[PDB]
Design a protein around this ligand. Structure first.
Ligand SMILES: O=C1N(Cc2ccccc2)[C@H](COc2ccccc2)[C@H](O)[C@@H](O)[C@@H](COc2ccccc2)N1Cc1ccccc1
Lengths: 99, 99
């Protein structure tokens, strides 16, 4: 798909067997989703941005399906305002920026 | 050009006669630059980030060249960790996400 940025680039993702709405975010190094439970061992992490830092739980080797393209990677879970797909998973689906 | 995401999508921008580095960020609705002096009057604006809200100053019709593309638009100045080019300017340079 070729996605215009007149609006926020929201897409559906399937994770944990759940369907969710997420933003394709090229400015984000990591993927961060709102509170949910994933199976596995997790590690605490602090991630910061505009507004300061938030504590998240880091889960590795998670499978996600973005618009139909499976991808595997680390996923951070915490009190984020919107589900964000960052560069660690966008590279796996082959997403590029073009102008 | 086509930009992949294995590295942060950093580009050089020219604003006020000077060169700065900035991040092409499809997750950011607006463009926010680190503290600097711009001409004119500014208006107040509050932006929600990952760690909360920050108050920034909004300047309108500012000329900024991004990778050789001249754009004119709204730029916010505030305590951001990095210069961020958001959708309001990414649309003026014809940027899309492709996968
Ligand atoms: O705070 C952020 N994050 C922080 C972050 C860091 C790592 C992983 C995920 C997120 C970066 C931006 O900041 C940084 C900080 C450090 C390094 C790189 C980018 C995203 O890239 C932006 O897209 C947007 C992401 O989060 C949100 C929150 C609410 C609604 C929509 C998006 N903003 C806020 C923002 C909003 C508007 C203009 C400018 C910046």
């Amino acid at each position: 798909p070729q996605i215009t940025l007149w609006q926020r680039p929201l897409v559906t993702i399937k994770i944990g067997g759940q369907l969710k709405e997420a933003l394709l975010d090229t400015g984000a190094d990591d993927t961060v989703l709102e509170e949910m439970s994933l199976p596995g061992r997790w590690k605490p992490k602090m991630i910061g941005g505009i507004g300061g830092f938030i504590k998240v739980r880091q889960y590795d080797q998670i499978l996600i399906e973005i618009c139909g393209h499976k991808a595997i990677g680390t996923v951070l879970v915490g009190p984020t305002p919107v589900n964000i797909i960052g560069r660690n998973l966008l590279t796996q689906i082959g997403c590029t920026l073009n102008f």
